[PDB]
């Protein structure tokens, strides 16, 4: 399992004869997939990447200057000029200056002065924008069955199966050996919108920075610094990063506003990280919609003999998983292969079994086996495996489980957005209602207020509620109170 190794899990279950389930896989999340009388699977999203993406804007974060020149004219003899006003990679400025007989002039008054300098970016201080192509994005999704073996996060499991998806792959069939085959179907058009996305890259040589950042498309085009596209030797708008002093009668000073890197790194705020591996560019935040087909799964070992109850030993004693399940491991010294007798008892009635096993029909094979995961009611229990017995106390209460599941639901909804209704979906009418309401209300808030800052949104929400308190009509008063409450829900209700 990888679900045992991760901070986050969700569970799905199909009733008997259910052939398809709908999943909304998030990067770094995982799903435990089950159906009545069929073997369980772990499913997760493993990467979202491209090789050699297309370039866009380059920006300069720190200017270098050379070879400056100056010229000036007296108040009568017209505007001053220099050859370097008409050449590539130059920045120039022209202004009036004070003049008189003391400076060897003809007459007292305002003259004119002109100044020129060569401009270039400091050798490693470039910022590069990159953009993905929908025709070349690869999504990687992986599956492993609960074989009953255990393998660490830094070890490779032979039962693990891998698949890759683009605009040009159909319903895939993946084979899992004795367990049969599983069918998997991506919809790459449902992924993170490329039109909102850019990948920002600075110097890769820094030991103590992220290698890339998942910046928004609009913000990256409104940046004020000097810029170009690839292959050009000249810089556009080079006058953004130098400024010139007040003139003296015969000279003027040019000043460099210095390395902007600290301004950029503070301005990025909460933006998600990305990473680079040679030619490969990975996103590290995003989601995919997919269908999993439970069409051809076999329950392994239904023909196997049951174990001798006496020859079991604990390999790893019972522990709380932190996901409200109990996990344990057993070692067995008899003949193999064989099937493990398991049950759990409420401490007061020995006739009733309460073990909800999440790995159906568990077995010992020649090479390995004997991991078990189970869920139990709250309070005292006895757990049995063969003639071994152990005493346990499951924490919490029935109210605690519905609260914890409710929290996971709300936390998913405020990250997936309107796609959150597709998880484990069924043809019930409410699946249309929820997706419609989120399309309407989400469309309203994003179009009306989407670009407004967090504290400004709170001030607007308070002002709109306060207009609701003060205005003279009771229906419109309530409408201003409710709509102010929506802006506060989209801010203080997101976090405070």
């Amino acid at each position: 399992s990888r679900c045992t190794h991760l901070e986050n899990r969700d569970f799905v279950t199909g009733v008997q004869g259910t052939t398809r389930l709908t999943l909304v896989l998030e990067l770094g999340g995982c799903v435990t997939v089950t159906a009545d009388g069929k073997p369980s699977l772990d499913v997760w999203l493993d990467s979202i990447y491209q090789e050699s993406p297309a370039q866009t804007r380059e920006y300069c974060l720190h200017a270098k200057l050379t070879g400056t020149k100056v010229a000036a004219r007296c108040p009568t003899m017209g505007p001053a000029t220099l050859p370097e006003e008409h050449q590539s990679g130059t920045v120039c400025k022209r202004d009036q200056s004070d003049r008189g007989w003391g400076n060897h002039c003809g007459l007292f008054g305002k003259g004119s002065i002109v100044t020129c300098v060569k401009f270039t970016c400091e050798d490693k201080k470039k910022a590069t924008g990159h953009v993905y192509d929908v025709n070349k994005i690869t999504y990687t999704i992986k599956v492993e069955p609960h074989t009953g073996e255990f393998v660490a996060a830094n070890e490779t499991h032979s039962g693990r199966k891998s698949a890759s998806f683009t605009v040009s792959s159909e319903k895939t069939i993946l084979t899992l050996g004795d367990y049969g085959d599983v069918s998997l179907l991506c919809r790459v058009a449902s992924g993170v919108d490329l039109a909102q996305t850019v990948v920002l890259a600075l110097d890769k040589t820094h030991e103590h920075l992220p290698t890339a950042w998942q910046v928004h498309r609009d913000w990256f085009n409104d940046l004020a610094l000097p810029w170009k596209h690839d292959g050009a030797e000249a810089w556009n708008e080079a006058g953004r990063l130098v400024e010139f002093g007040t003139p003296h009668a015969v000279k003027m000073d040019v000043f460099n506003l210095g390395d902007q890197t600290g301004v950029l790194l503070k301005s990025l705020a909460g933006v998600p990280v990305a990473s680079i591996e040679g030619t490969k560019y990975h996103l590290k935040s995003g989601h995919v919609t997919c269908e999993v087909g439970l069409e051809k799964l076999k329950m392994k070992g239904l023909t196997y003999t049951v174990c001798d109850k006496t020859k079991f030993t604990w390999k790893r004693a019972p522990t709380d998983s932190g996901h409200d399940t109990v996990v344990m491991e057993v070692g067995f010294s008899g003949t193999r292969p064989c099937r493990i007798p398991v049950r759990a008892v409420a401490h007061g009635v020995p006739e009733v079994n309460v073990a909800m096993l999440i790995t159906p029909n568990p077995t010992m094979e020649n090479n390995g086996g004997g991991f078990i995961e189970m869920q139990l009611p709250p309070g005292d229990n006895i757990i049995y495996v063969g003639d071994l017995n152990h005493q346990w106390f499951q924490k919490g209460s029935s109210i605690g489980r519905v609260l914890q599941k409710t929290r996971k639901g709300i936390e998913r909804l405020t990250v997936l957005g309107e796609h959150a209704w597709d998880f484990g979906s069924v043809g019930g009418v409410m699946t249309s209602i929820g997706r419609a309401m989120h399309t309407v209300l989400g469309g309203a808030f994003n179009t009306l207020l989407g670009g407004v800052g967090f504290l400004p949104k709170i001030l607007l929400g308070v002002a709109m509620a306060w207009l609701g308190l003060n205005m003279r009509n009771p229906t419109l008063s309530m409408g201003f109170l409710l709509s102010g409450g929506l802006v506060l829900a989209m801010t203080l209700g997101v976090g405070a």
Binding site: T197, H216, S267, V271
Partner: protein, 74 residues
Amino acid sequence: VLIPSHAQRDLTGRGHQWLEGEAVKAHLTRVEGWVWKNKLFTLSLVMVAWLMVDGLLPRILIVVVALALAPAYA
């Protein structure tokens, strides 16, 4: 030249993030910093509101808004 703050309904996606944003819990530290650094002035806003505004609820709200806004402009 300035660079605008990026912070919004971003490409959120549940992974690791760069340094988290100066929301209300952080903004109150900027208010406390200005109240300490500008101490001798701070009585004036409270004294004027206490003289000028009738009703304790709107009086308190006007003082709270004034002190919350001040370090965004000072």
